[PDB]
Amino acid sequence: VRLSGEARKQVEVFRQNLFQEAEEFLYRFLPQKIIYLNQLLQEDSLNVADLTSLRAPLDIPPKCGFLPGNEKVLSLLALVKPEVWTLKEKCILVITWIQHLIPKIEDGNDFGVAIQEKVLERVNAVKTKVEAFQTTISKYFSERGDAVAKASKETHVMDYRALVHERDEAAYGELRAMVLDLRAFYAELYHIISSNLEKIVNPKGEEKPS
């Protein structure tokens, strides 16, 4: 097509800038972000064994007392949720960094192509699990909206209105498993990329005596 002299050079500078920006991420920050969530999971807040006091007991006898959210779980996601969304932002640039290294398209010498495809496939697989958590993160907050409202509305059944507290113990047990995989996401994607850094950054022979 028609390639503008100024417009193309603006991208070529940004092609190298976003390429060097991910190198700073792939080298310094990934080994650091692996051990940050480790100290986050080793926090005794997520490691509490007894879930009886971890729930949010509702006072259900309308002037019935105001029922707030769970400040324990909300404080846990206050640390976890920004790291879940930040991880996805880090992977998108890696997806761009992988798609920026797509070699010149040819029929042969696809060995460097298959390496990048398998890595990009596993990054997209982890990215799917991250946004799947982000759905369940926002879903449980919608679960609390229907559970607390229906429990406070029905005063005849004295059991199920107490049984909605089991979702509080459910979210805590699932959160600890979600933050457990959240830590592995940096570790798994690092081992995949770092070990294969040989031909990923250079998926070309470019030795052709012909």
Partner 1 sequence: YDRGVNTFSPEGRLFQVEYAIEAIKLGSTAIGIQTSEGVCLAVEKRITSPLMEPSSIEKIVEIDAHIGCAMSGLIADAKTLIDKARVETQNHWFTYNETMTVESVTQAVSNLALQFGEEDADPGAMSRPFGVALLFGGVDEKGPQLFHMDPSGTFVQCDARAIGSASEGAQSSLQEVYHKSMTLKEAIKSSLIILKQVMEEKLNATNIELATVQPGQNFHMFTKEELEEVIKDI
Partner 2 sequence: FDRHITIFSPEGRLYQVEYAFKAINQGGLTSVAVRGKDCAVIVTQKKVPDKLLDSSTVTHLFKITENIGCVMTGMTADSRSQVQRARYEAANWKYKYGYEIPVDMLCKRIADISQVYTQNAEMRPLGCCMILIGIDEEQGPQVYKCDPAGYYCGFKATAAGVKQTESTSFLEKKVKKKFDWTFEQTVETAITCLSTVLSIDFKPSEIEVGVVTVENPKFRILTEAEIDAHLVALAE
Partner 3 sequence: LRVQPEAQAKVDVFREDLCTKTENLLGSYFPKKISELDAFLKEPALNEANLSNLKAPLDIGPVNCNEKIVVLLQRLKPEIKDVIEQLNLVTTWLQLQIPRIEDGNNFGVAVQEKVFELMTSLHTKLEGFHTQISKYFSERGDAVTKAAKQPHVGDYRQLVHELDEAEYRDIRLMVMEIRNAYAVLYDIILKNFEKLKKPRGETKGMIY
Contacts to partner 2 by CB under 8 A: 106-109, 205, 207-210
Cα separation values, 94 from 25, 44, 50, 71, 99, Å: 9, 32, 40, 35, 8
Q: How many angstroms from the chain centroid is the CA of residue 141?
A: 18
In the complex with partner 3, the residue whose CB is nearer, 173 or 209, is 173
Using CB under 8 A as the binding rule, the residues of this chain from 47 to 66 that contact partner 3 are: 51, 60, 62, 64-66
95 binds partner 3 (CB under 8 A): yes
Q: Looking at 43, 75, 128, 145, which residue binds partner 3 (CB under 8 A)?
A: 145
Nearer to partner 1 (CB atom), residue 92 or residue 114: 114
> How many residues form the binding site for partner 3 (CB under 8 A)?
94
Binders of partner 1 in range 78-107 (CB under 8 A): 106-107
Contact status: 132 vs partner 3 (CB under 8 A): no
Cβ–Cβ < 8 Å for 199, 115 = yes
One symbol per residue from 106 to 145: x for binding partner 1 (CB under 8 A), - otherwise; what is it? xxx-------------------------------------
Residue number, 114 or 125, with CB nearest to partner 2: 114
> Helix/strand/coil (H, E, C) string of 126-165?
HHHHHHHHHHHHHHHHHHHHHHHHHHHHCCCCCCHHHHCC
CA distance 39 to 34: 9
* Residues contacting residue 126 through CB under 8 Å, at least 6 positions apart: 91, 185, 188, 189
Single residue of 75, 173, 204, 205 touching partner 3 by CB under 8 A: 173
Choose one: 46-54, 66-74, 137-145, 202-210; the region binding partner 1 (CB under 8 A). Answer: 202-210
Choice between 112 and 151, CB closer to partner 2:
112
Amino acid at site 78:
A
CA distance 71 to 54: 10
Work out how close the CB of 112 gets to partner 1 at its nearest, in angstroms, rounded to a whole number: 12
In whole angstroms, give the CA distance from residue 39 to residue 73: 18
Q: Give the interface with partner 1 as residue ranges (CB under 8 A).
A: 106-108, 205, 207, 209-210
